Design a binder for this molecule. Structure first.
Ligand SMILES: CC1=CC(=O)NS(=O)(=O)N1Cc1ccc(Cl)c(Cl)c1
Length: 133
């Protein structure tokens, strides 16, 4: 029951500062433009200890499955090869990606009827708000 309130299909309804976040991460111009246009659906499911998060968009479909606290290798939508660990901290899913001596953190939180995604790279934060599909 660890992630019950996250489970479901979620659609992006607003974004702030995502271009800047992508710049800070090192994403190039053409990928930023196409990726920034996307309105993904985020599909979260749980089977036993295994959490699966899919992102489906016109840019790039991704899928990760993981156990909390157990590092895994992830190829991101922008084609970074990262080492990821996802933990629950006070009811927030905290997803850390490490690559090339860099780190970024994506937090997913349930707030009211929304799922709020906060993406941080150094001093740059992007906030993306999803609603149930
Ligand atoms: C971080 C993030 C938040 C989200 O809510 N949806 S998303 O856009 O698929 N995404 C992954 C991502 C997509 C594209 C790029 Cl270019 C980068 Cl760096 C990351």
């Amino acid at each position: 029951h660890m992630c019950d309130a996250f489970v479901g299909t979620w659609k992006l309804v607003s974004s702030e500062n995502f271009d800047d976040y992508m710049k800070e991460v090192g994403v190039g111009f053409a990928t930023r433009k196409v990726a920034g246009m996307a309105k993904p659906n985020m599909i979260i499911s749980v089977n036993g200890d295994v959490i699966t998060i899919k992102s489906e968009s016109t840019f790039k479909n991704t899928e990760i499955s993981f156990i909390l606290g157990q590092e895994f290798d992830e190829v991101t939508a922008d084609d970074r090869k990262v080492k990821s660990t996802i933990t629950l901290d006070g009811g927030v899913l905290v997803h850390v990606q490490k690559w090339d001596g860099k780190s970024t953190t994506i937090k997913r939180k349930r707030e009211d009827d929304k799922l709020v995604v906060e993406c941080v790279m150094k001093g740059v934060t992007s906030t993306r708000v999803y609603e149930r599909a």
